[PDB]
Amino acid sequence: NSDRQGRPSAFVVVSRITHRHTLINVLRYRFRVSRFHFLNNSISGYGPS
């Protein structure tokens, strides 16, 4: 959002899912609020990433 890392949010996630990208897809459900902000600083800062 503003402060070069955000307020780095931690999670202990349990799931029956073993596989990798099928597990990050259920995170692609949860984290759009952070993911749309992840796209934001890609254009809010040019040079800084």
């Binding site: 897809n25 259920v26 692609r28 459900y29």
Partner: protein
């Protein structure tokens, strides 16, 4: 918006990423609604 408001308010709890999964594995979406004095209930439909 209007049809699902007209009946059946619930649209999705899952993604499109998991919407194929409910087609793949039949998942039990609706819970036991708490209004259960009789017990198990059924229905189906054929248009005449």
């Amino acid at each position: 918006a209007w049809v699902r408001q007209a009946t059946g308010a619930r649209r999705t709890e899952v993604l499109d990423s998991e919407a194929i999964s409910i087609l793949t594995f039949g998942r039990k979406t609706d819970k036991g609604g708490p209004a259960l004095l009789h017990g198990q209930r059924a229905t189906c439909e054929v248009i005449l």
